[PDB]
Amino acid sequence: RNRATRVECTTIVNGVRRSFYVYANGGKGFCKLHNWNCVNCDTFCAGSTFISDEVARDLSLQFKRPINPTDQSSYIVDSVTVKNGSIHLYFDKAGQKTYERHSLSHFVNLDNLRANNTKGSLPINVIVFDGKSKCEESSAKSASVYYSQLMCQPILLLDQALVSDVGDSAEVAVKMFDAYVNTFSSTFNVPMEKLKTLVA
Amino acid sequence: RNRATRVECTTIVNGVRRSFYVYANGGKGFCKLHNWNCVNCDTFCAGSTF
Amino acid sequence: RHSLSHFVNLDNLRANNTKGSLPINVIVFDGKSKCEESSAKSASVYYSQLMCQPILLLDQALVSDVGDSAEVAVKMFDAYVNTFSSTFNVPMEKLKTLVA
Amino acid sequence: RNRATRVECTTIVNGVRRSFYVYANGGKGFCKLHNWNCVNCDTFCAGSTF
Amino acid sequence: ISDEVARDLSLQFKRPINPTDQSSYIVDSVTVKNGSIHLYFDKAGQKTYE
Numbered sequence: 493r494n495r496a497t498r499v500e501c502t503t504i505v506n507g508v509r510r511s512f513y514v515y516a517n518g519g520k521g522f523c524k525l526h527n528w529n530c531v532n533c534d535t536f537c538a539g540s541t542f543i544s545d546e547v548a549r550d551l552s553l554q555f556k557r558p559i560n561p562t563d564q565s566s567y568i569v570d571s572v573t574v575k576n577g578s579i580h581l582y583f584d585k586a587g588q589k590t591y592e593r594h595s596l597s598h599f600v601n602l603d604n605l606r607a608n609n610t611k612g613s614l615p616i617n618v619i620v621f622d623g624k625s626k627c628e629e630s631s632a633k634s635a636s637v638y639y640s641q642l643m644c645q646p647i648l649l650l651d652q653a654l655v656s657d658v659g660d661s662a663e664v665a666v667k668m669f670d671a672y673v674n675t676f677s678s679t680f681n682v683p684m685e686k687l688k689t690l691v692a
Numbered sequence: 693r694n695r696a697t698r699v700e701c702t703t704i705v706n707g708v709r710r711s712f713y714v715y716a717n718g719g720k721g722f723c724k725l726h727n728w729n730c731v732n733c734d735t736f737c738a739g740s741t742f
Numbered sequence: 743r744h745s746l747s748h749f750v751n752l753d754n755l756r757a758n759n760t761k762g763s764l765p766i767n768v769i770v771f772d773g774k775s776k777c778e779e780s781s782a783k784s785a786s787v788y789y790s791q792l793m794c795q796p797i798l799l800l801d802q803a804l805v806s807d808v809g810d811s812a813e814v815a816v817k818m819f820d821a822y823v824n825t826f827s828s829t830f831n832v833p834m835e836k837l838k839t840l841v842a
Numbered sequence: 843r844n845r846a847t848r849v850e851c852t853t854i855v856n857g858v859r860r861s862f863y864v865y866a867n868g869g870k871g872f873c874k875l876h877n878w879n880c881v882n883c884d885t886f887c888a889g890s891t892f
Numbered sequence: 893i894s895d896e897v898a899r900d901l902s903l904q905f906k907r908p909i910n911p912t913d914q915s916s917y918i919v920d921s922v923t924v925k926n927g928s929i930h931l932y933f934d935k936a937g938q939k940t941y942e
Contacts, residue, residue, distance in 0.1 A: 534906060623854075627764060630738060645906075657857075703787060712792055736795035742790075
C-alpha cells in the first residue's frame with residue numbers, strides 16, 4: 493500500500509518541539525520480528541532503521557497497530573578504564589556486563605559536548621552531565637531520545653564527577669618542560685622575552 | 693490499554709507557553725491512592741512520577 | 743538543610759534567569775514588588791515539574807541580612823599585608839595588584 | 843515498607859560505583875534527635891549505624 | 893584486525909570487539925650482512941628485528 497521511505501514524528505526538547513525522520517524499506521519485506529518495513533535492521537550504519545522505545549509507543553498510537561521496539565534509548569555508565577590512549581566505558585545490557593571503547597581525543601573539551609550545545613550536534617556517542625543537579629539529568633534524559641534518533645545506535649551517559657578525576661595529565665610535565673627550557677637557556681644564554689612568549 | 697511512559701502537558705510562564713513531560717509506569721500496577729500508573733511514587737529521585 | 747555555597751550570587755538564581763535552569767531547590771524574590779511575587783508563583787509550578795520535589799520560596803529581605811561575612815576580615819587582611827611588608831619591605835605596586 | 847533493617851545506597855569512588863548497606867532497628871523504637879531508626883549510634887561496632 | 897577496521901566491524905555487528913595488533917611500526921636502525929638487510933624496531937617497549 494505505502495512505498496514511503498521516511499516517516500515524520502516529533503518530540504520535545506528544552507521546551508520546544510523538533511522533528512525528525514524515520515527510514516523505511518519502501519516495499520520489500522515485512523520483518524515480522526518488529527512488523528515494520530525495515531532495511532538491514534541489525535547495523536548502526538547511516539540510513540538504517542532505528543526504532544527507539546520512547547517513540548515506538550507514539551508510532552504505534554498514530555498507526556493503530558502494535559509495534560515492537562528494537563533498542564532502548566540510552567544506558568548509564570558504571571566504570572571507565574584508560575589504557576594506551578584509549579578509554580573503555582562499562583554498562584549493562586539486558587543483564588550482561590558489556591563495554592565500549594573510544595578515543596581520548598574527544599574528551600579534551602567537555603563544554604562542547606555537554607547537554608544542549610549551541611551547535612546542536614554531537615561529535616561522539618556519549619554525553620556528560622552533573623550527577624547532583626536534577627535539572628541537568630532531566631534535560632540529558634530528554635535530549636537522549638532526540639540525539640539517539642537523529643543518528644543511529646543508543647547514547648551512553650557519563651557522569652561529570654566520575655570522568656573529572658580520570659583526566660589528570662601532569663603539571664609535573666609542565667615543570668619538566670620548564671627544567672628543559674632552563675637547561676637550554678643555560679646552554680646558549682637566550683633572552684628571556686622570546687622564551688616566555690613561546691612558553692605561553 | 694496504554695503503555696505510554698510520557699504524557700504531554702503545557703503551562704504559561706512569562707506570557708509564553710512551555711511544555712514538559714510526566715513520567716508513568718507503562719503497564720504495571722495501578723496505585724489506587726492516586727489512580728495513576730506511577731513508578732515508585734514516594735522518592736524525589738529523577739524519573740519518578742510527580 | 744542546604745549548603746551555603748549556592749547563596750554567594752543571588753542574581754543567577756532569582757526568578758526567570760537567562761539560562762532557564764535552577765541549580766538548587768529554592769528561589770529568591772522581593773516581598774514588596776507584587777509582580778515579582780506573581781512571577782515567582784507562576785514559575786514555581788513549571789520548575790517543580792521540570793525536576794521532582796517541591797520548590798521553596800525565599801524572601802530577599804530575610805536572607806539579605808543573614809549573609810554578612812565581615813569587612814573586619816578585609817581590615818585584618820590589610821593588617822597582615824602591612825605586617826608582611828614591614829617584615830620584608832616589598833614594593834607597593836605588586837602588593838596592590840594582588841590585593842585587588 | 844522502609845521499616846526494614848537494611849537500606850542500600852550507592853556512592854562514586856575513583857572510577858567505579860560501589861554499593862553499601864545501612865542498618866536500622868527494624869521498627870522498634872525511634873530517635874527524636876536523629877529522626878532515624880538508629881541503633882547504638884553512640885558507639886562503633888559491627889552492625890551499627892553511621 | 894586493526895583499530896581502523898575494528899570500530900567499523902563493531903558498528904556493523906552491534907557489539908564490541910578487541911583488535912589484535914597495531915597497523916604499522918617505524919624502523920630505527922639498519923644492518924646489512926651477507927647480501928641481506930636487517931631492520932630493527934621497538935614493539936611494546938621491547939627490541940624487535942627482521
